[PDB]
Design an enzyme around this catalytic site. Structure first.
Site, mmCIF file in Angstrom:
data_model
loop_
_atom_site.group_PDB
_atom_site.id
_atom_site.type_symbol
_atom_site.label_atom_id
_atom_site.label_comp_id
_atom_site.label_asym_id
_atom_site.label_seq_id
_atom_site.Cartn_x
_atom_site.Cartn_y
_atom_site.Cartn_z
ATOM 1 C CB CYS A 177 -3.977 9.212 9.099
ATOM 2 S SG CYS A 177 -3.302 9.531 7.676
ATOM 3 C CG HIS A 186 -0.716 13.672 4.408
ATOM 4 N ND1 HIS A 186 0.403 12.690 4.642
ATOM 5 C CD2 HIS A 186 -1.873 13.188 4.905
ATOM 6 C CE1 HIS A 186 -0.124 11.900 5.209
ATOM 7 N NE2 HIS A 186 -1.484 12.084 5.396
HETATM 8 N N1 NAD Z 1 1.557 5.863 8.341
HETATM 9 C C1 NAD Z 1 0.596 6.644 8.124
HETATM 10 O O1 NAD Z 1 0.886 8.010 8.131
HETATM 11 C C2 NAD Z 1 -1.000 6.054 7.758
HETATM 12 C C3 NAD Z 1 -2.066 6.516 8.381
HETATM 13 C C4 NAD Z 1 -3.402 6.216 8.308
HETATM 14 C C5 NAD Z 1 -3.222 4.845 7.358
HETATM 15 N N2 NAD Z 1 -2.207 4.568 6.964
HETATM 16 C C6 NAD Z 1 -2.570 2.982 6.139
HETATM 17 O O2 NAD Z 1 -1.575 1.825 6.825
HETATM 18 C C7 NAD Z 1 -1.224 1.122 5.822
HETATM 19 C C8 NAD Z 1 0.402 0.859 6.221
HETATM 20 O O3 NAD Z 1 0.871 2.195 5.997
HETATM 21 P P1 NAD Z 1 2.749 2.222 6.657
HETATM 22 O O4 NAD Z 1 2.965 3.541 6.549
HETATM 23 O O5 NAD Z 1 2.747 1.080 7.843
HETATM 24 O O6 NAD Z 1 3.540 1.622 5.678
HETATM 25 P P2 NAD Z 1 4.810 0.638 5.468
HETATM 26 O O7 NAD Z 1 5.297 0.352 4.152
HETATM 27 O O8 NAD Z 1 5.763 1.186 6.364
HETATM 28 O O9 NAD Z 1 4.406 -0.654 6.174
HETATM 29 C C9 NAD Z 1 4.040 -1.935 5.310
HETATM 30 C C10 NAD Z 1 4.745 -3.212 5.982
HETATM 31 O O10 NAD Z 1 4.202 -4.467 5.719
HETATM 32 C C11 NAD Z 1 5.144 -5.198 5.125
HETATM 33 N N3 NAD Z 1 4.658 -5.884 4.044
HETATM 34 C C12 NAD Z 1 4.692 -5.739 2.653
HETATM 35 N N4 NAD Z 1 4.142 -6.818 1.916
HETATM 36 C C13 NAD Z 1 3.961 -7.863 2.580
HETATM 37 C C14 NAD Z 1 3.760 -9.031 2.487
HETATM 38 N N5 NAD Z 1 3.136 -9.810 1.528
HETATM 39 N N6 NAD Z 1 3.436 -9.985 3.791
HETATM 40 C C15 NAD Z 1 3.777 -9.305 4.916
HETATM 41 N N7 NAD Z 1 4.273 -8.218 5.231
HETATM 42 C C16 NAD Z 1 4.186 -7.242 4.125
HETATM 43 C C17 NAD Z 1 6.360 -4.148 4.762
HETATM 44 O O11 NAD Z 1 7.634 -5.107 5.011
HETATM 45 C C18 NAD Z 1 6.185 -3.167 5.736
HETATM 46 O O12 NAD Z 1 6.872 -3.312 6.881
HETATM 47 C C19 NAD Z 1 -1.314 1.584 4.408
HETATM 48 O O13 NAD Z 1 -2.393 0.993 3.752
HETATM 49 C C20 NAD Z 1 -2.189 3.226 4.733
HETATM 50 O O14 NAD Z 1 -3.158 3.297 3.886
HETATM 51 C C21 NAD Z 1 -0.855 4.933 7.126
#
Ligand code: NAD
Ligand code: NAD
Lengths: 332, 332
Positions: A150, A177
């Protein structure tokens, strides 16, 4: 016409991908499946109601093995077990946060997705893409790519405009952040001693890889930027506070205008601006990668400059996942 | 031996000045009277119990219109009428935030007080003081002085060690600040469009004149600094995030070493450091004007620098208000 995607990990970003697709009205992406090891019922419930983004816009039913808005639901521990071949998956969207590595994410290729897009920096990524900035470099030579972060998605377009207009000799970025999912509500065992403390109680300094990364998307800037973050008690929306030294003497009006031009021209829908006196909550649910805050441009002695740039760290990025996936599909 | 003070405005800062004296156990200052808008009993209750600082560490008894822990209590919104002459008040402590102006503040001398110390920048101040940096400039020729601001008091010491060590060519400071009582809980009418916004709900950019004030107290940096604030959803403790061009090619270790020295030597009790991985709430109730966070110092190509400096915007300042009150009392 339509690129067939699968969402692996139906967490914040995974759900936000889905929501961005329905809200925007776009017709170029079909969400064929989702994978996640928690309850199918719990997954639909979290889709329905979100504390940051509000109610799902539409109806959400669990019918058999799928979620009707008709999306197939899977639960595989091992991404290589997913029926991507059978389901004619064009692009697997790796969203779980635990398979960010190119080694790890290539499992979706094994399962028969034609390409993979990681929703985070990826180690050994074929390419790290900031849509609207460098997605045009995508080609048949790329199979597993990163969508950057992001923060990178916010800083790069702005960097680009600044570098083109006044040149950036060197720059330091602090991103203020909102708390994220890897932080706890109360102090507890953690990989990092900063992020182990009560998230809604403190300003917490923390590391970000985004400034280095902008060095790659814009090779002209390699090694000229560094960056850190400060986590604060808000649930969503973040901001880049950038101080840089300019190669040529300049003014606030000069910088603001190049921003307006870019926002109205070639970065329309990626970069936007405001001339109003707004606060973080006013950008919640904004789909841009960056919204530049004109009020806040300051320039000492024509050469030391500071800008401030908001970004919805969930909503901006999730909309970008969609654009990148579509641009990527065209190289298949 | 002792300095006679009257506190005008038993608000967050008025009450914390009193706690500071009690906690340090300093015998060099005696609170003779206080004035405030409201009850005798309410002032008592507020002193006893503080949501940020906890139990008042003694007993507070209501007795007549006076509080015993013996200090006399008044309720004239007009400062001109209070009887400082026949109370022999050496130094008055204007703490309301509404007679900041010198022409206004000079009432306390009309109403009898020998000198006056505004808790807050002032308009026409005979001298603006940051204790530990410039207090030895106070002369008999000064009647109404300013204690500067929480932020001014934390940037100034650090600017001094930096400049005098490596030289500040140009500097831009962002302060990430806890909310303060001029902000509301919900969006409501305000003279300032940013500060009108719901205070625990957003990061809120706002102006501070601290960078400029540092250029006046450290004359060598006249107009070489600029700054702003972003208010965030914390109730106490702020921080300075400073980006500057250094006159000499430098390093992190060199930067932090110079801070060690000022901390242990000439700025002891004003400036401290930490080598630990700490977050904002770890600095609550810390009496220092500035606490330097080593970890967080960064230098790009040996010229562009960034440091991070904590400060309890309530507790540090209120203690300086005591130290200033004493140093002032000597020019009498
Ligand atoms: N949300 C933000 O502000 C943002 C911004 C930029 C980048 N990101 C990136 O996006 C990625 C995800 O972020 P998020 O905020 O969605 O986190 P989150 O924890 O809400 O999403 C992770 C999801 O994947 C699932 N999961 C975990 N292990 C799993 C597995 N083995 N198999 C299938 N599903 C599994 C979880 O149940 C969860 O729903 C991160 O790596 C982060 O670097 C997030
Ligand atoms: N609190 C901080 O973080 C901080 C830091 C640096 C400087 N300051 C300065 O200290 C000053 C005081 O702010 P505060 O934090 O105490 O806020 P506050 O509103 O809690 O304190 C002001 C108090 O004075 C009283 N008051 C208001 N009008 C009055 C009047 N006409 N007559 C008598 N009493 C009156 C109010 O009842 C209130 O209790 C401000 O000028 C501020 O700039 C505050």
């Amino acid at each position: 016409m339509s690129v067939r995607v699968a969402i692996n990990g139906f967490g914040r970003i995974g759900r936000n991908i889905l929501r961005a697709i329905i809200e925007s009205g776009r017709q170029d992406i079909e969400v064929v499946a989702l994978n996640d090891l928690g309850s199918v019922e719990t997954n639909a419930h979290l889709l329905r109601y979100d504390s940051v983004h509000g109610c799902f816009p539409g109806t959400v039913q669990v019918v058999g093995d799928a979620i009707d808005i008709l999306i197939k639901v899977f639960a595989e521990r091992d991404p290589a077990q997913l029926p991507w071949k059978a389901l004619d998956i064009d692009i697997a969207l790796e969203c779980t946060g635990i398979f960010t590595a190119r080694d790890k994410a290539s499992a979706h290729l094994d399962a028969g997705a034609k390409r993979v897009l990681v929703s985070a920096p990826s180690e050994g990524a074929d390419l790290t893409v900031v849509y609207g900035v460098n997605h045009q470099f995508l080609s048949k030579e790329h199979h597993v790519i990163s969508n950057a972060s992001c923060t990178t998605n916010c800083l790069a377009p702005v960097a680009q405009v600044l570098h083109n207009t006044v040149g950036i000799e060197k720059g330091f970025m602090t991103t203020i952040h909102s708390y994220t999912g890897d932080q706890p509500v109360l102090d507890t065992m953690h990989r990092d001693l900063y992020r182990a403390r009560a998230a809604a109680l403190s300003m917490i300094p923390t590391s970000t890889g985004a400034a280095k990364a902008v060095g790659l998307v814009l090779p002209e800037l390699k090694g000229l930027l560094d960056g850190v973050s400060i986590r604060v008690p808000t649930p969503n929306v973040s901001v880049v506070d950038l101080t840089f030294t300019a190669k040529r003497s300049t003014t606030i009006e000069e910088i603001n205008t190049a921003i307006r031009t870019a926002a109205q021209g070639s970065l329309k829908g990626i970069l936007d601006y405001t001339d109003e006196k707004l606060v973080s909550c006013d950008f919640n649910h904004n789909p841009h990668s960056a919204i530049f805050h004109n009020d806040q441009t300051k320039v000492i002695d024509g050469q030391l400059c500071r800008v401030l740039v908001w970004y919805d760290n969930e909503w901006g990025f999730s909309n970008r996942m969609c654009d990148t996936a579509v641009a990527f599909a065209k190289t298949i």
